[PDB]
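Notebook, bench 3.
Goal today: get a predicted structure for DNA polymerase from Monkeypox virus so we can plan the truncation constructs. The sequence was checked against the plasmid map this morning, with no discrepancies at the termini. Length recorded as 929 residues. Pasting the sequence as submitted so the record is complete.
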Amino acid sequence: MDVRCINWFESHGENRFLYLKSRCRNGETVFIRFPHYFYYVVTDEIYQSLSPPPFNARPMGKMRTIDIDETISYNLDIKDRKCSVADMWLIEEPKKRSIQNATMDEFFNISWFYISNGISPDGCYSLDEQYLTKINNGCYHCDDPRNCFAKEIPRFDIPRSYLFLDIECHFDKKFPSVFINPISHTSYCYIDLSGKRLLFTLINEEMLTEQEIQEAVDRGCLRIQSLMEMDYERELVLCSEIVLLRIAKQLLELTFDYVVTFNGHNFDLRYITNRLELLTGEKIIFRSPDKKEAVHLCIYERNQNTTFHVNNNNGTIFFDLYSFIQKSEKLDSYKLDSISKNAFSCMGKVLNRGVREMTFIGDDTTDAKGKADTFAKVLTTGNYVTVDEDIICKVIRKDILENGFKVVLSCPTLPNDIYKLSFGKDDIDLAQMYKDYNLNIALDMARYCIHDACLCQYLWEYYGVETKTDAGAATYVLPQSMVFEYRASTIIKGPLLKLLLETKTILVRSETKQKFPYEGGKVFAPKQKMFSNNVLIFDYNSLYPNVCIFGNLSPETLVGVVVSTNRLEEEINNQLLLQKYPPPRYITVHCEPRLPNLISEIAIFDRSIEGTIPRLLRTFLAERARYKKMLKQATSSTEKAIYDSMQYTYKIVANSVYGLMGFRNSALYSYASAKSCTSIGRRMILYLESVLNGAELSNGMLRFANTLSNPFYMDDRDINPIVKTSLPIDYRFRFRSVYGDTDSVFTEIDSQDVDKSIEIAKELERLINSRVLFNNFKIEFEAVYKNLIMQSKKKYTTMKYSASSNSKSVPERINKGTSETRRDVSKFHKNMIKTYKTRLSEMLSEGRMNSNQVCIDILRSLETDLRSEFDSELFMLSAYICPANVPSFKLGSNQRIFYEVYFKRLTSEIVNLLDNKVLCISFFQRMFG
């Protein structure tokens, strides 16, 4: 019988078990229960000399154990590590025994299960059917996982179930409390195994008066007096609160494959269960699959920025999107409004204008393929849209096109014909509506809560979490319900263990580590944006993993660190370690001194056998590069999800390995290796940005900086500063010194072609990341053209992104910083920040002569505004009172205070765009008096 695995889980009673929940071909679901053992690793000696004899033990082979402790050497006499060799035994037992000198401890009893047994938590297995004995209906027990899970088949499709919920509560103060406030609304999106999606909402009837309830029943709703009274097909129901809560219980008490919410783990579910306890004294109960354990719902936490989780043990996965997008996405606000805003969007086109309402259409080529369809999907329960920015309007008419959408909005008439359409701000005042409760707002808020619940599913389909949860269970060998609950240090041990088991290696740290805190990293800061004449945007393809491969860094390829407390010891040691330890078999790095006291720290690495971290990284990059292709060759729509989730997985795992070498408590911990990263890397950065000036002309000049040398040694690799390109024609375009970062490189062409300059970056990629480079270091060429405004770190600027497809281009103009979201300040006299920003942007449409015009106009107009309304809505840019007599925080008629500061600011912040350092401090002085 051929099953596909859904999720594995554990049980922590007196007795341990592992459960597999699985679905067959036809859809009938099965539970399989294995015992759960504590594992250990012993040397042969300890294996036989041990008593009592263990439960089971089978030999692993013949492994090499290595000590990797880091010891600062002083003279030069570097010694060699204890690389013992022996025969290993893997020992399993049902209880917890403490055994002295048992290595290979850092791993969980769950990885030992999947590895030593040949089981992958994503497999589609044809079970061998004689080993599975009945326990109960859909609960078979197994004893020999090897023979039972011996087969394998190609992957086959299954159905799944869901439930997406939301509640809304009565409130009148700051923000409600379970002891004082009843639950007004309760919504639910129920998608069944048979695959029909049913929506419904329940309305608290103790909140309304008698004849209003009458109008409701006459109006289309339903009324119920008990649990048995409800059907799941009524679009709306009216019921008391006890019934509402009993339905919530009974319906989260089922075996849904997922239960998806948004902040549902500390607010929604906590409210529901607590109110239920409060009113009726009954509880939410979870059985085991074998009916021999019962638990009650009680949220717990995993403080790491905490994260709340649900304590269920029947196989369900209780997801919560809030945590997931907090982890996997780096956004500025994690309010449902903003994510639903920028995720779901499309460009629409007006067909007829009108009075106080307009009509839009959304389709094919009007904008990119597909998002019209998604927009039409969420529009099915939408109420308020945003007109291209900031302009909220209620929806008037909906129409599901065959391919897009027609919508009619209550928005005022506008000039243009094409617009952005961004789905959600929902400016609604809830408290007031709670003050004057009548039937109409009840029927409105039903439409709001149901839409919220459905958004909580449109997102889960937008991110494809259902396939990341599987890619992460195959790579990151672990159950499906662990994949998003833990930190990097806990998820890498799977692939690491699988590596150690092929290379017959064990690493043991017999020392207690010491922490020498250090730099995290240097911040790079550009000094001009705009007139620069559109910068390219060359990118690094995974520097840190490439460096950890080149230098062959590892905790066990480190010969030693040698130091020196004073000069005349450096130069001794220094001509010494070149006579011995010569390149290329050896690479040596100067690090930042550990104990603030000496001044050396040369670390030496042996580039003759593969370190462990280099093996790991090599496989990761290798397989990501493959799935990058099988995606390009996939045609069905179910594969293009599986492969894309896989490459994303490998990307994550790779980019998580540098920062983890530094973590003192990880398993890849190696102080010297961490410090040698950032060191090789930052030499690499300076070596690129240095040779980049390269005024190309006379059919190819491109000297770069000066020389094309290779640091760390002489490679004998054609250092010829002059070089001939493909050379489309002759040119006279020179490059300006650049700014760069850990990840990118902003080479600002000073010639400024017009948009064809691109042909210049192509061929530039042709050479720099191909001829001015040594090993696996390589090419990217992204593109962020136009005259950005770098108001700060790479995080804050204009977007203005116009990718390599310049043919008939439309760029992303709006914003990259989005530090324009939190106020925490006053709100009267600004709002110009927008207008100042837009003026400064539009003034640089040209590139040559609007520099002086920029400074002149911005500072003159700012002075005129400031003076006019010093003597006669928005403050976002992410109580002590002052007088204004120079020529709990609220405003008064005392506006003349902060006119003075923010106007100084608006120009003091944006300084990395212009170079007219004259009028800048000139207006600075003008406003001084």
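The longest strand covers residues 56-67. The chain is about 30% helix and 20% strand.
Flagging this for group meeting.
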